[PDB]
Amino acid sequence: MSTAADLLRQGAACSVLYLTSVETESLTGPQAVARASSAALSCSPRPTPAVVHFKVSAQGITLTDNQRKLFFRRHYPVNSITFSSTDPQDRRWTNPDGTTSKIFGFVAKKPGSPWENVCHLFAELDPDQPAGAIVTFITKVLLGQRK
């Protein structure tokens, strides 16, 4: 993941599976994705998911409203991001079609509220950029967690 510069030096704008957003201000890194994922299953705030745009950059992460059907716009820069994970305990999302995909979540502070952070839950998509790798290098290059 040290040679992950290839992704940040480029700034890939890929497509991801949008699920839902959950508050994780009191949670930690992985636990954030946990409450976010579990709540999305137990409570199910969102019924049918959709494929939206996602941009990975070392200056911050950005969400993109490709179709603007549910609710998308942008994400949070490095000054707001606190953590990123591909899954809490290696859980997957079951699409209405029956196929299962990983569920990753990003922990970032919302503008105006630096004391709190929210974890936006998004399922994996775009086989060119592995979800279990994208957030992994992101955490390392964004926060400087790189070994």
């Binding site: 992704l7 030096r9 890939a12 950059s57 070392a58 060119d128 790189r146």
Partner: peptide, 14 residues
């Protein structure tokens, strides 16, 4: 999908 993109930032690294 298949091709890896890279058009948005200014080539950063932490």
């Amino acid at each position: 999908e298949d091709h890896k993109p890279g058009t948005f930032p200014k080539a950063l690294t932490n």
